[PDB]
Amino acid sequence: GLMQFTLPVRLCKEIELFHFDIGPFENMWPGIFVYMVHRSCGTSCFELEKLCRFIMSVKKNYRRVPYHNWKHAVTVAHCMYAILQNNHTLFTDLERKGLLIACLCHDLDHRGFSNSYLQKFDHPLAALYSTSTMEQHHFSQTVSILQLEGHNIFSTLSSSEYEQVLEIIRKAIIATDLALYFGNRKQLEEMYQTGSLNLNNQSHRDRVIGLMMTACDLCSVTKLWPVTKLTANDIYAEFWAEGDEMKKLGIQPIPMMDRDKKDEVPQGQLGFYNAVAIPCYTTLTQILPPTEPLLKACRDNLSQWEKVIRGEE
Ligand SMILES: Cn1cc(-c2ccccc2)nc1CCNC(=O)c1c(C(=O)N2CCC2)cnn1C
Numbered sequence: 001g002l003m004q005f006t007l008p009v010r011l012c013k014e015i016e017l018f019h020f021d022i023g024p025f026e027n028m029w030p031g032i033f034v035y036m037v038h039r040s041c042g043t044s045c046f047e048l049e050k051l052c053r054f055i056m057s058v059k060k061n062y063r064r065v066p067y068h069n070w071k072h073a074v075t076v077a078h079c080m081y082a083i084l085q086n087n088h089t090l091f092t093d094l095e096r097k098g099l100l101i102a103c104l105c106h107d108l109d110h111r112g113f114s115n116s117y118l119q120k121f122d123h124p125l126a127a128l129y130s131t132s133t134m135e136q137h138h139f140s141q142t143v144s145i146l147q148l149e150g151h152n153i154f155s156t157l158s159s160s161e162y163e164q165v166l167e168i169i170r171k172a173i174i175a176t177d178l179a180l181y182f183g184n185r186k187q188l189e190e191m192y193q194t195g196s197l198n199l200n201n202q203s204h205r206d207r208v209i210g211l212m213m214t215a216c217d218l219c220s221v222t223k224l225w226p227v228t229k230l231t232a233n234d235i236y237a238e239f240w241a242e243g244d245e246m247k248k249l250g251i252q253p254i255p256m257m258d259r260d261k262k263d264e265v266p267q268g269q270l271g272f273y274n275a276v277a278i279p280c281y282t283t284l285t286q287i288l289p290p291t292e293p294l295l296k297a298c299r300d301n302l303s304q305w306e307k308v309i310r311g312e313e
Pocket residue numbers: 178217218220221232235255256257261262263264265266267268269271272
């Protein structure tokens with residue numbers, strides 16, 4: 001009860017900032033997560049023993065892939081932490097409980113392959129879940145781990161509160177399917193610009209949380225340039241392996257996944273910042289003004305990719 005987690009001073013200060021990098025000491029990431037839960041939710045939200053057991057089972061069910069790994073899970077949770085702490089009063093008790101957990105679980109048991117590769121390979125998951133194939137799997141893995149003995153971190157919630165938190169987690173994890181982000185953002189843009197956006201409207205809150213999920217998921221573009229750049233290497237390491245696997249099925253992969261077209265990565269980043277990232281953080285900033293630092297950091301990184309194209313690095 002009187003047992004707080006406390007971090008070294010540099011981490012205590014910098015964890016509050018959007019651009020925080022959780023660092024290369026894997027063994028500190030559980031502690032960093034518990035710290036964020038305690039500050040964003042409270043020391044009372046979860047039984048520490050159940051929470052620690054839950055976190056260590058989640059870690060065990062992330063695979064040793066270049067990008068969609070346990071570090072990504074904790075990085076995405078930290079971005080969510082920063083959003084929630086900078087928007088103190090906008091979110092419910094159930095939302096603060098559910099969203100950090102959703103973020104920690106959102107890529108559970110990821111294999112480093114896209115929904116599209118699973119459908120072309122004809123993976124069993126593609127027959128079980130025809131759309132948002134991996135994201136339905138991630139939610140399924142979340143429920144599995146919640147149902148392990150001594151892993152029920154939500155055990156103090158009523159039946160209907162428990163159903164609501166699991167429904168927040170489900171929608172939040174499904175929203176990380178980037179195929180769904182375009183339409184979600186277009187609807188939020190229209191709603192914001194016609195003044196019809198209503199945070200008492202559950203379907204509106206769902207849309208806003210979905211956009212927070214995209215923002216946290218893509219948050220490598222909001223880090224300091226060296227973090228952003230070195231993260232992109234891990235992203236492409238996965239894409240190019242998928243490209244190799246597409247060539248093994250007799251399918252030319254898209255250029256994003258073809259290691260033979262490495263040279264076009266910089267132009268590929270420009271399209272991604274302009275089509276996906278900047279629009280994401282712009283709409284998020286319109287709805288939640290204190291998230292501006294994400295938009296600002298994303299624009300700084302777009303400017304760095306522009307410099308790469310000009311051979312200024
Ligand atoms: C759209 N496009 C095209 C090219 C390209 C490259 C070489 C040659 C031709 C085309 N590169 C990109 C963008 C790469 N995507 C990212 O970098 C990315 C993601 C991301 O797509 N998701 C899915 C799992 C994570 C998340 N964060 N970030 C930074």
